[PDB]
Design an enzyme around this catalytic site. Structure first.
Site, short mmCIF file in Angstrom:
data_model
loop_
_atom_site.label_atom_id
_atom_site.label_comp_id
_atom_site.label_asym_id
_atom_site.label_seq_id
_atom_site.Cartn_x
_atom_site.Cartn_y
_atom_site.Cartn_z
N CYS A 20 55.99 46.69 33.65
CA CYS A 20 57.43 46.85 34.10
C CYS A 20 58.12 45.47 34.06
CB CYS A 20 57.13 47.29 35.57
SG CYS A 20 56.58 45.96 36.64
N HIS A 26 55.42 41.13 41.18
CA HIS A 26 54.08 41.04 41.00
C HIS A 26 53.75 39.62 40.91
CE1 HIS A 26 53.63 45.22 40.20
NE2 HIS A 26 54.27 45.18 39.06
N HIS A 137 37.74 37.51 45.61
CA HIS A 137 37.93 38.73 46.16
C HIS A 137 37.11 39.89 45.56
CE1 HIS A 137 40.70 37.12 49.31
NE2 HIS A 137 41.64 37.12 48.39
C1 LIG Z 1 54.53 42.07 47.68
N1 LIG Z 1 53.92 42.22 48.84
C2 LIG Z 1 54.40 41.45 49.76
C3 LIG Z 1 54.00 39.58 49.38
C4 LIG Z 1 52.35 39.45 49.02
C5 LIG Z 1 51.55 39.40 50.26
N2 LIG Z 1 50.36 39.17 49.89
C6 LIG Z 1 49.12 39.72 50.23
O1 LIG Z 1 49.37 40.24 51.51
C7 LIG Z 1 48.01 39.66 49.88
C8 LIG Z 1 46.91 40.79 50.02
C9 LIG Z 1 45.68 40.58 49.09
C10 LIG Z 1 45.32 39.55 48.56
C11 LIG Z 1 46.37 38.22 48.54
C12 LIG Z 1 45.87 37.10 47.79
N3 LIG Z 1 46.51 35.99 47.86
O2 LIG Z 1 45.97 35.08 47.08
C13 LIG Z 1 44.75 35.68 46.52
C14 LIG Z 1 43.76 35.07 45.73
F1 LIG Z 1 42.92 35.87 45.32
F2 LIG Z 1 43.35 34.03 46.39
F3 LIG Z 1 44.14 34.52 44.63
N4 LIG Z 1 44.63 36.78 47.06
C15 LIG Z 1 47.51 38.48 49.17
C16 LIG Z 1 52.43 38.27 48.18
N5 LIG Z 1 51.34 37.94 47.35
C17 LIG Z 1 51.65 36.64 46.71
C18 LIG Z 1 50.50 36.18 45.80
C19 LIG Z 1 50.78 35.36 44.70
C20 LIG Z 1 49.78 34.63 43.98
C21 LIG Z 1 48.42 35.25 44.11
C22 LIG Z 1 48.20 36.01 45.09
C23 LIG Z 1 49.15 36.58 45.97
C24 LIG Z 1 52.84 36.15 46.94
S1 LIG Z 1 53.53 37.12 48.00
C25 LIG Z 1 52.06 40.65 48.31
C26 LIG Z 1 52.50 42.06 48.58
ZN LIG Z 2 44.41 33.20 48.65
ZN LIG Z 3 54.83 46.72 37.74
#
Ligand SMILES: CN1CCC(CNC(=O)c2cccc(-c3noc(C(F)(F)F)n3)c2)(c2nc(-c3ccccc3)cs2)CC1
Ligand SMILES: [Zn+2]
Ligand SMILES: [Zn+2]
Ligand SMILES: [K+]
Ligand SMILES: [K+]
Length: 368
Positions: A20, A26, A137
């Site tokens: 997408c 993402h 993870h």
């Molecule tokens: C868009 N919506 C709302 C914002 C959202 C919130 N994230 C989470 O709840 C979430 C859920 C599961 C795993 C993770 C997670 N963060 O780092 C890692 C890692 F594995 F350490 F890299 N995992 C994060 C965001 N995720 C990121 C993100 C950026 C880079 C890497 C991982 C997450 C930024 S905002 C995702 C879902």
């Molecule tokens: Zn993390």
């Molecule tokens: Zn997508």
């Protein structure tokens, strides 16, 4: 190869993107490693290192940590779940490019492994692997939380199986618990896993990593979760993480006395990650200082591997400070007011719980 710090990077890992196209929907995006890579050159650090491309992890290497079904599913080409945006993924956050994700995931695993081996042989002093997608993870048979293969876990297993390191310390300072890494090594006393993560009573992803989770069988006591509770107020940052290192991480690490240190180096505890991505206030200087502290172990055999971190400048700041530490530049702890502040009461109770649990297993935790 010369005896300096090694950097792993390759454009093959940029190709992991949902079809997408949207880098906002993402957030685990190519720009994360791309910006770190050019930042290291802009600040003059990159040329001081030995820069390496890395390689594909073999199917055999992946099976040392993951199941056969898992490795067939994510490690191989079909010929040899739907999302709201129209792309394919394993779940809503963990996307899957049907042409590139497998390749990029295998490259991350393969490259962290290759770097760890070069450091384990003392062919390189230490290293920093600028890789995506992240790994910690991913467990034995589940891709989740943006992860497919646990690169750090695969690297650790290979070092052991190739006899290149007896005792391995894995430190994970990403703000999320590395559920995958904990599971893989839960019963192995030759691997010490120490995580610092936001836990908040199991209401923060992944939900695992309670202080009680100490390992099992022969591995009892060799799993240490510095599980922060109490939430975001008062702020969690340098005083608390420095305190964690003084009191828990370093003394236990020294008592363990590893031959090589691996770091799941996520930077989502850094400033610029709001709730509920992180909400913590760890500075770049503190990340580089923690790296410097881990460099006193294992004759300096240290390997960092990028896990999480979104805010570009924050992860660039932090990554810059970690590489500088690796190259020998030192942080004066007296150069920063705020490091003079006592850690907050939530962090003290959190550490108190860690000490209560692990006084069963470690002399340095056994007080009066
Ligand atoms: C868009 N919506 C709302 C914002 C959202 C919130 N994230 C989470 O709840 C979430 C859920 C599961 C795993 C993770 C997670 N963060 O780092 C890692 C890692 F594995 F350490 F890299 N995992 C994060 C965001 N995720 C990121 C993100 C950026 C880079 C890497 C991982 C997450 C930024 S905002 C995702 C879902
Ligand atoms: Zn993390
Ligand atoms: Zn997508
Ligand atoms: K962690
Ligand atoms: K263990």
């Amino acid at each position: 190869l010369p005896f300096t710090t090694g950097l792993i990077y390759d454009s093959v890992m940029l190709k992991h993107q949902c079809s997408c196209g949207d880098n906002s929907r993402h957030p685990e995006h190519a720009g994360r490693i791309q910006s770190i890579w050019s930042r290291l050159q802009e600040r003059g650090l990159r040329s001081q290192c030995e820069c390496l491309r890395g390689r594909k992890a073999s199917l055999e290497e992946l099976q040392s940590v993951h199941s056969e079904r898992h490795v067939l599913l994510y490690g191989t080409n079909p010929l040899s779940v739907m999302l709201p945006c129209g792309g394919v993924g394993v779940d809503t956050d963990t996307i899957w490019n049907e042409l590139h994700s497998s390749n990029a995931a295998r490259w991350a695993a393969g490259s962290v492994t290759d770097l760890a081996f070069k450091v384990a042989s003392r062919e390189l002093k230490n290293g920093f692997a600028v890789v995506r997608p992240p790994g910690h993870h991913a467990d034995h048979s589940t891709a989740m939380g943006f992860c497919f293969f646990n690169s750090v876990a695969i690297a650790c297993r290979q070092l052991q199986q190739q006899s290149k390191a007896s005792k391995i310390l894995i430190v994970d300072w990403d703000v999320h618990h590395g559920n995958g890494t904990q599971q893989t090594f839960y019963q192995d006393p030759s691997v010490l896993y120490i995580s610092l993560h936001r836990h908040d009573d199991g209401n923060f992803f992944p939900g695992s990593g309670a202080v009680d989770e100490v390992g099992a069988g022969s591995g009892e006591g060799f799993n240490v979760n510095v599980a922060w509770a109490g939430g975001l107020d008062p702020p969690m940052g340098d005083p608390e993480y420095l305190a964690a290192f003084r009191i828990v991480v370093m003394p236990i690490a020294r008592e363990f006395s590893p031959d090589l240190v691996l770091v799941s180096a996520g930077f989502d505890a850094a400033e610029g990650h709001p709730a509920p991505l992180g909400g913590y206030h760890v500075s770049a200087k503190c990340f580089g200082y923690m790296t410097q502290q881990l460099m006193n172990l294992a004759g300096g055999a240290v390997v960092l591997a990028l896990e999480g971190g979104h805010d570009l400048t924050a992860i660039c700041d932090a990554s810059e400070a970690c590489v500088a530490a690796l190259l020998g530049n030192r942080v004066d702890p007296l150069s920063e007011e705020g490091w003079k502040q006592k850690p907050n009461l939530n962090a003290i109770r959190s550490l108190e719980a860690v000490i209560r649990v692990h006084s069963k297993y470690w002399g340095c935790m056994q007080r009066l």
